[PDB]
Design a protein around this ligand. Structure first.
Ligand SMILES: c1ccc2c(NCCCCCCCNc3c4c(nc5ccccc35)CCCC4)c3c(nc2c1)CCCC3
Ligand SMILES: c1ccc2c(NCCCCCCCNc3c4c(nc5ccccc35)CCCC4)c3c(nc2c1)CCCC3
Ligand SMILES: *[C@@H]1O[C@H](CO)[C@@H](O[C@@H]2O[C@H](CO)[C@@H](O)[C@H](O)[C@H]2NC(C)=O)[C@H](O)[C@H]1NC(C)=O
Ligand SMILES: *[C@@H]1O[C@H](CO)[C@@H](O[C@@H]2O[C@H](CO)[C@@H](O)[C@H](O)[C@H]2NC(C)=O)[C@H](O)[C@H]1NC(C)=O
Ligand SMILES: *[C@@H]1O[C@H](CO)[C@@H](O)[C@H](O)[C@H]1NC(C)=O
Ligand SMILES: *[C@@H]1O[C@H](CO)[C@@H](O)[C@H](O)[C@H]1NC(C)=O
Ligand SMILES: *[C@@H]1O[C@H](CO)[C@@H](O)[C@H](O)[C@H]1NC(C)=O
Ligand SMILES: *[C@@H]1O[C@H](CO)[C@@H](O)[C@H](O)[C@H]1NC(C)=O
Lengths: 534, 534
């Protein structure tokens, strides 16, 4: 061995780079390969482990991002563009990044970040996912992985080994296997790996908790605004096959066999796929994504609900939560009457339109039930109430209530649950006020952006960020976000009986109980019963 | 003619009696016949007009009450016994009573009282229905009528002219015809007759508004805690026939034809019928009564809802309303966990039991919907909340929400609607506090009991009574409860757009809008849709 930036791993040697962070410096190993390029005939296939290399892999720069749909709704607007790929796209995109304190630790807590983006997009290289603040401030080794999205990751033709489904999740698993096998060389402890992620990454985290083939590869878990049972995070194998054939149909493929369909899809340029990906959804919907995880009998041995009910999952500690206005983004992008530069007060007809888009699988009685539950009939033409109503419908149904169902099912068998409600609206938010505390906007706090002066956060936002980062890292280290014997207020354990959680914001800690219970009884128990009966 | 107590009517002469009232005196003509005794072979038959008589009918004393079930739940307790027959019972019971100011007016406003009691009980002669205070204080001629209840009034074998159904309602119509024909001799104006009643009497009032054969016989209407469309106030002709045959079956009757069944029922003593009357209900229920009005194609030409929708009803002014805790009585008598001398905090299981009794025609999804609508899931074991919840369920479903549906349908075609919410709990109430403002407990205020010192009301309750009596009588006189050009606060008109109502209590008037709208959308629109689909 020779110097701090050189690490010899089981796949070969890697040379990283020294990075400044908050007046100090750490090491960064960017763009390390964890799988063979899933290109050509390996499109849609399971990933294969990266063949070891001779020489020194240069890991001074970010890798390519996976091939994906790029948002152009607000060209140049920082609010949207901060989510788009900031590197060239390529199918050659299975890489990971590691930020390591300096001096190199010996055996320290590891955190592995799994990006969101609806299973159709996302990048490990975004500015908001820069691991250097968290690695430096909390003294963790912070890994970000990547995985195939869209059809490249989730095209599913169950029965075929050429496009089985779930390959994106197997990408994530392979990176976790590599971390298990190699992170000791960077000074990480492979026995103390926390996986964490947001939205689709939060669902993904839950999915590794459930999947037998993944559970052993990590210790602990954090789920931010996402749950493995969310209504958008998986499809049946029949629905997967249906969408894959419809994809073929949109590209004039031969549909006579899997073999013909796959061969045709493998010859298309990546953009051809992405150009028609959104055409295969079965309903007029918002918060529904075309190529997502499939309940295949393999990655997931049975239905998610039967797994949760029977305790068929990894038993460990989890820390998880939701933002106050999870719905607002999806409505802005997808529902009539919502706009970025308006207050977006919603008429009764835009309301009813929005209900239908939000619960696309409901029949008419079901839509009446939703409408009744969320309408203030003493004031039914209030545009603000209609707007916020629909924001709650989308948030509750797609994020908060499936998370609460997960949390209640998990807590029965698990070894410690910590639950949060993030309701701080950042002082420098570029999105309009009506959108509130937006899906994804806790991530900048978790990654320490407010510690960076030039980004224009307040001092109280810096404090909030430091507190969150320290909850997250102390939890990853110990299974408990609270500092042993500190003076600070204690985040209590969520238990089956008392169902406690805390808010996360710049005000003194407040403990509450039974997060959105009234609505979640509707979404989790009554409505599914209504739709099954009718 | 000769003196004030002697009146010559079209049926013959009547001698009344002079009655003291509040330091003064008025005349009372008690127990005047309006139909032939509906006895023997006339049991279950339409009423026949009373044959005129020679000589002077002595009308100095109250008539017999109709044959009915007598409440013995709290023997001797004034709260219950004030509702029971206070005269001997007889099938010979079709009489009316008239209270007339002194000196005899010439042509004054007339108010005709139709008692409640679920169509199975009630009496014109109760102390709480004594018309002398209202007649004296407001200078109206106050009539109370009677009508056959239970099977005697409502046994229905559609197709037969021996027991057609609705004969009790035809009793009421015959008394109204007699008033139309004869009240001028008492100094009443037959062109200005208001019919008013409570619970089943309120439903009955609505029924005469709807029925073509009754509409012409009165001018204006007042409905207290009852609506013609209430779920307990009518049955289909198939359900009527079913219950009449089951009545036969309970009495070992021959069931081979209507002719045989009726003949057998006509030989029974009245008590035999009453002893088994409650056995014929199709469900385990509260707020459901065995022999009630039938939707026959004659009294009611079509379904009540089609009548209301098409404007097929008398167009006039109406004044109507509800009490705050309409449910409490039915729960006390009928639901587990409610008792008179306890606070009646209700367990979750007594709650679920009570929901089932309250909505006996719902399937299991429907019961889940009701449960969800009325349960505070942040506090679901609160015994007080469970108690009050069920009190609201019973009240909303059986009284307030059908009244609100009636009020909204009527107001579209009608000529002026005044709506109230009576929420004063009397200072001397003998029932427990949990029961609140009980079904029937506005009646003592409408009839002026609080003006009587010995009855132990407060001075503010006396004021309330006087205000109510004056609303009721000014409305009966003019079609508007408000005094032209007075200084007092104005009860506004309920309109389709603004849906205003007032509270009635001892505090300054408050105007509100959209009475229990949130719950009434559930009962009136969503739940019936849910039960029809499933
Ligand atoms: C986590 C991850 C990402 C986030 C995010 N990204 C921005 C979301 C990008 C919006 C594109 C939707 C159009 N979705 C589409 C797709 C296709 N075709 C389409 C064709 C027509 C219309 C829409 C289409 C094909 C490929 C798949 C997508 C944003 C937010 N939070 C996030 C939190 C908050 C607000 C702004 C955006
Ligand atoms: C308007 C009119 C009457 C009212 C009233 N009357 C008191 C209500 C009497 C309770 C009896 C129910 C049992 N109903 C029953 C019947 C039969 N059999 C039964 C057999 C078993 C059990 C019950 C039975 C046969 C005949 C029909 C009834 C009361 C109130 N408000 C009223 C307002 C308020 C509280 C106290 C009572
Ligand atoms: C998490 O699991 C640990 C250990 O498996 C639990 O700690 C045990 O608690 C039981 C009962 O209180 C004791 O009998 C054991 O001695 C404990 N084990 C150890 C090693 O401490 C702990 O209670 C679990 N935590 C939660 C929140 O369920
Ligand atoms: C009740 O009916 C009366 C009369 O039928 C209504 O008064 C009429 O109002 C219309 C339109 O404002 C006028 O053209 C008539 O001249 C009025 N008639 C009389 C004789 O006054 C009255 O508006 C109705 N009230 C309600 C509340 O609907
Ligand atoms: C590694 O490759 C990157 C690619 O841009 C380059 O910028 C850098 O100079 C290279 N460093 C070394 C040590 O080869
Ligand atoms: C911070 O604020 C300045 C001054 O208004 C502004 O010009 C700049 O764009 C902001 N910087 C960032 C990184 O948002
Ligand atoms: C009328 O009959 C009643 C019946 O009790 C009786 O009390 C009263 O004395 C009679 N009065 C006359 C004038 O006959
Ligand atoms: C009125 O109050 C008195 C004194 O306590 C009581 O004894 C009496 O029963 C009450 N009277 C009535 C009519 O309720």
């Amino acid at each position: 061995d020779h110097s701090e930036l050189l690490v010899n791993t089981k796949s070969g040697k890697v040379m990283g780079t020294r990075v400044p962070v908050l007046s100090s410096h750490i090491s960064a190993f960017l763009g390390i390969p964890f799988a063979e390029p899933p290109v050509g005939n390996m499109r849609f296939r399971r990933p294969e482990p990266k063949k070891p290399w001779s020489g020194v892999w240069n890991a001074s720069t970010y890798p390519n991002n996976c091939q994906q749909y790029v948002d152009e709704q607000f060209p140049g607007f920082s609010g949207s563009e901060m989510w788009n790929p900031n590197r060239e796209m390529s199918e050659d995109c299975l890489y990971l990044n590691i930020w390591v304190p300096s001096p190199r630790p010996k055996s320290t807590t590891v955190m592995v970040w799994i990006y969101g983006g609806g299973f159709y997009s996302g990048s490990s290289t975004l500015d908001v996912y820069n691991g250097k603040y968290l690695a430096y401030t909390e003294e963790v080794v912070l890994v970000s992985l990547s995985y195939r999205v869209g059809a490249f990751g989730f095209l599913a033709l169950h029965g075929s080994q050429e496009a089985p489904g779930n390959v994106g999740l197997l990408d994530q698993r392979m990176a976790l296997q590599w971390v298990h096998d190699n992170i000791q060389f960077f000074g990480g402890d492979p026995k103390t790996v926390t996986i964490f992620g947001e939205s689709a990454g939060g669902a993904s985290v839950g999915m590794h908790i459930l999947s037998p083939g993944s559970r052993d590869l990590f210790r602990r878990a954090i789920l931010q605004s996402g749950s493995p049972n969310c209504p958008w995070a998986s499809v049946s194998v029949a629905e997967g096959r249906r969408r894959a054939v419809e994809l073929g149909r949109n590209l004039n493929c031969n549909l006579n066999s899997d073999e013909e369909l796959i061969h045709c899809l493998r010859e298309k340029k990546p953009q051809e796929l992405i150009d028609v990906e959104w055409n295969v959804l079965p309903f007029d919907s918002i918060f529904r994504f075309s190529f997502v995880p499939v309940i295949d009998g393999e990655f997931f041995p049975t239905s998610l609900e039967s797994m949760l009910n029977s305790g068929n999952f990894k038993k460990t500690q989890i820390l998880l939560g939701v933002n106050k206005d999870e719905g607002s983004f999806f409505l802005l992008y997808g529902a009539p009457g919502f706009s970025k530069d308006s207050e977006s007060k919603i008429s009764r007809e835009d309301f009813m339109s929005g209900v239908k888009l939000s619960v696309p699988h409901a029949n008419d009685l079901g839509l009446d039930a939703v409408t009744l539950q969320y309408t203030d009939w003493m004031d039914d033409n209030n545009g603000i109430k209609n707007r916020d109503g629909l924001d709650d419908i989308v948030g509750d149904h797609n994020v908060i209530c499936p998370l609460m169902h997960f949390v209640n099912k998990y807590t029965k068998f698990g070894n410690g649950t910590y639950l949060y409600f993030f309701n701080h609206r950042a002082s420098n938010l570029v999105w309009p006020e009506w959108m509130g505390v937006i899906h994804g906007y806790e991530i900048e706090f978790v990654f320490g952006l407010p510690l960076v002066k030039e980004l224009n956060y307040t001092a109280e936002e810096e404090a909030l960020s430091r507190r969150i980062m320290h909850y997250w890292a102390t939890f990853a280290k110990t299974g408990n976000p609270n500092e042993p014997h500190s003076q600070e207020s204690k985040w209590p354990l969520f238990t089956t009986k008392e169902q406690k959680f805390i808010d996360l914001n710049t005000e003194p800690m407040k403990v509450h109980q039974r997060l959105r219970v009234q609505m979640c009884v509707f979404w989790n128990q009554f409505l599914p019963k209504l739709l099954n009966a009718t």
